Amino acid sequence: SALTVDDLKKLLAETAGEDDSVDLAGELDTPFVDLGYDSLALLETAAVLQQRYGIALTDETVGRLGTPRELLDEVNTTPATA
Numbered sequence: 496s497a498l499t500v501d502d503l504k505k506l507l508a509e510t511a512g513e514d515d516s517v518d519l520a521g522e523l524d525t526p527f528v529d530l531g532y533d534s535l536a537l538l539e540t541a542a543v544l545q546q547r548y549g550i551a552l553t554d555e556t557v558g559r560l561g562t563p564r565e566l567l568d569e570v571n572t573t574p575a576t577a
Contacts, residue, residue: 496571503567507532510540519563526561534558537566544570 504519511517511532522530527537534557541552552569560566
């Protein structure tokens with residue numbers, strides 16, 4: 496468990512800007528579109544996300560997905576061994 500919804504959440508806010516009631520712990524299954532966050536915001540943190548490691552979680556995949564857990568799982572999924 497390198498990255499969690501905790502370290503990601505903070506990254507979501509910092510990027511998005513939800514410092515009022517961005518309690519992800521109490522809203523994961525719910526899709527961003529449902530909450531408030533917009534694809535854009537995602538695209539934002541998306542780069543910043545890959546800016547650290549080197550992923551491509553852009554609209555491409557961000558399109559099929561629309562949840563936070565899927566944003567963390569994705570990064571906490573893509574292996575690097577093969």
